[PDB]
Amino acid sequence: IEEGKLVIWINGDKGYNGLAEVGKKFEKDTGIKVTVEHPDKLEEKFPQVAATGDGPDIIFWAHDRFGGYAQSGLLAEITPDKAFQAALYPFTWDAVRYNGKLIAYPIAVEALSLIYNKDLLPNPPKTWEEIPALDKELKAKGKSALMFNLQEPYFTWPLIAADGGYAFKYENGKYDIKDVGVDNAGAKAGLTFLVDLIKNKHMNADTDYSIAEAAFNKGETAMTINGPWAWSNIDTSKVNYGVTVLPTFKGQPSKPFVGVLSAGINAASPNKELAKEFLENYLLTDEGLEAVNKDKPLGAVALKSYEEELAKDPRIAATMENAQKGEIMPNIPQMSAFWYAVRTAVINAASGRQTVDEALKDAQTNAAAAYQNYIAKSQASEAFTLADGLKTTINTNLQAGTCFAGGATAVTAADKVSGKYGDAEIGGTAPNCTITYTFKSSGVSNKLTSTKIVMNVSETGILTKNSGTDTPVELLPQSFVASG
Numbered sequence: 001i002e003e004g005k006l007v008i009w010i011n012g013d014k015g016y017n018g019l020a021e022v023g024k025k026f027e028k029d030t031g032i033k034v035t036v037e038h039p040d041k042l043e044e045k046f047p048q049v050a051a052t053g054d055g056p057d058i059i060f061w062a063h064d065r066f067g068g069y070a071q072s073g074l075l076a077e078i079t080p081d082k083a084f085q086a087a088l089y090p091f092t093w094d095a096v097r098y099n100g101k102l103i104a105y106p107i108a109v110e111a112l113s114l115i116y117n118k119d120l121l122p123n124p125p126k127t128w129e130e131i132p133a134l135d136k137e138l139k140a141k142g143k144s145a146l147m148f149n150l151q152e153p154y155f156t157w158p159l160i161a162a163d164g165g166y167a168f169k170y171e172n173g174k175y176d177i178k179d180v181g182v183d184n185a186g187a188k189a190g191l192t193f194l195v196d197l198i199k200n201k202h203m204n205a206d207t208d209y210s211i212a213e214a215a216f217n218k219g220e221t222a223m224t225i226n227g228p229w230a231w232s233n234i235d236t237s238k239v240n241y242g243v244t245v246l247p248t249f250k251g252q253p254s255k256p257f258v259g260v261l262s263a264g265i266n267a268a269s270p271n272k273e274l275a276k277e278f279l280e281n282y283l284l285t286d287e288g289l290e291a292v293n294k295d296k297p298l299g300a301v302a303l304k305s306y307e308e309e310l311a312k313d314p315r316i317a318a319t320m321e322n323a324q325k326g327e328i329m330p331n332i333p334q335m336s337a338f339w340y341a342v343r344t345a346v347i348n349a350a351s352g353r354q355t356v357d358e359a360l361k362d363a364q365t366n367a368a369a370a371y372q373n374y375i376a377k378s379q380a381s382e383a384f385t386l387a388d389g390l391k392t393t394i395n396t397n398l399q400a401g402t403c404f405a406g407g408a409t410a411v412t413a414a415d416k417v418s419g420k421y422g423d424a425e426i427g428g429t430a431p432n433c434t435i436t437y438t439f440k441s442s443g444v445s446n447k448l449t450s451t452k453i454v455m456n457v458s459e460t461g462i463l464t465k466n467s468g469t470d471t472p473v474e475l476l477p478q479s480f481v482a483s484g
């Protein structure tokens with residue numbers, strides 16, 4: 001990570017061009033260049049690159065992923081003065097609190113709404129159950145009732161939760177991480193309704209974000225389900241749209257998981273004070289939020305002064321009505337595993353590859369498998385932590401003409417280093433020095449036990465994959481694997 005610069009990652013559906021304008025302003029006032037990027041699969045790429053000490057200075061995502069990042073030591077604890085904290089709503093700070101510590105800046109509150117074409121559908125349905133017959137009628141005029149992103153469980157969750165689906169049971173001030181709530185009658189009823197929509201040819205299992213967006217914005221489908229960020233592209237389209245409450249299911253509201261768009265600081269960033277000043281004094285201002293919101297709407301913003309104006313928008317009022325019917329997502333480390341499990345179940349049921357019963361029955365197991373991989377990847381990141389220390393040791397004693405000591409050709413104890421999950425030591429000969437990290441035979445993931453990561457050290461300190469590595473390739477940072 002470059003010192004004296006700011007690299008920002010934010011998802012491609014957000015107002016990153018508007019964010020870059022706030023960036024350019026910061027660059028004018030400070031001389032600090034700000035670069036805004038939007039990598040695909042950003043929320044999965046960041047933990048990998050941050051593990052090797054690289055990545056963005058600042059990462060934006062909904063708050064649900066941040067407990068996982070914090071747990072893996074990837075986030076800097078944030079430190080705003082109480083005067084600043086008073087500028088944002090209290091419940092938004094709560095969303096970014098993990099283990100007592102604030103782990104990000106809250107930016108905006110997002111919930112899914114029902115978006116409808118007022119010309120096709122002046123009076124949109126209040127119930128999911130009306131939608132099949134509505135589609136049949138619209139098909140006669142060459143239109144469809146509803147299209148939305150079926151590939152991400154975020155979009156199907158409001159229906160799954162309506163009759164009783166839940167992520168983790170909340171009992172006695174804690175989440176029960178072993179009580180996952182998609183293997184119950186309520187979840188099954190919601191997913192069954194969805195699968196029948198596909199079986200009855202009212203929806204296609206392959207519909208994704210782009211397909212649904214293009215169909216709604218071109219007037220081919222009467223309704224879609226999406227968040228505030230989507231409104232901008234509809235604004236530029238011919239469509240006259242309305243934003244309203246999600247349909248009910250079995251007389252109960254759809255319950256979208258509510259996300260707080262948040263900005264965290266990379267633990268490995270050399271630019272932490274700069275990141276803080278950008279976020280506190282440029283982004284989280286009326287002018288800063290407006291710049292982004294003008295690009296792609298944020299929803300209901302955490303900043304009280306600017307949300308004062310936004311709240312008069314009927315679209316934000318619907319956003320907040322849906323948010324209240326739903327629930328704020330947990331931020332616990334198991335959230336990404338939960339999301340992997342629900343994505344898999346929904347897709348397996350959608351495609352017809354598994355029954356709704358079988359798909360949902362496998363979810364907790366699938367979540368566990370995902371979480372075990374997450375733990376192993378986190379533990380493996382220690383090798384790059386230890387190697388970074390050892391790599392400076394390597395360059396300081398290369399002066400003695402060797403990879404070690406003040407001249408030895410065996411590793412001194414000053415060339416070894418102990419870790420929590422394994423030990424690293426310098427190796428090699430001549431100017432081609434290596435670092436080897438060996439996992440313990442127990443007390444670490446059984447995916448990792450007794451395996452080793454072997455790194456070649458360039459003269460410039462860049463670590464590449466040596467073929468002696470037998471730590472599983474899929475648990476290593478992809479950039480490291482690529483160098484192999």
Ligand SMILES: OC[C@H]1O[C@H](O[C@H]2[C@H](O)[C@@H](O)[C@@H](O)O[C@@H]2CO)[C@H](O)[C@@H](O)[C@@H]1O
Pocket residue numbers: 011013043061062063064065110152153154155259339
């Ligand atoms: O689909 C699972 C996914 O849901 C949420 O992601 C949302 C995100 O919150 C929104 O800002 C927007 O980008 O759409 C995403 C879904 O495509 C969770 O935040 C995420 O962790 C989870 O994987």
Ligand SMILES: [Mg+2]
Pocket residue numbers: 119240
């Ligand atoms: Mg008209």
Ligand SMILES: [Mg+2]
Pocket residue numbers: 196
């Ligand atoms: Mg059936």
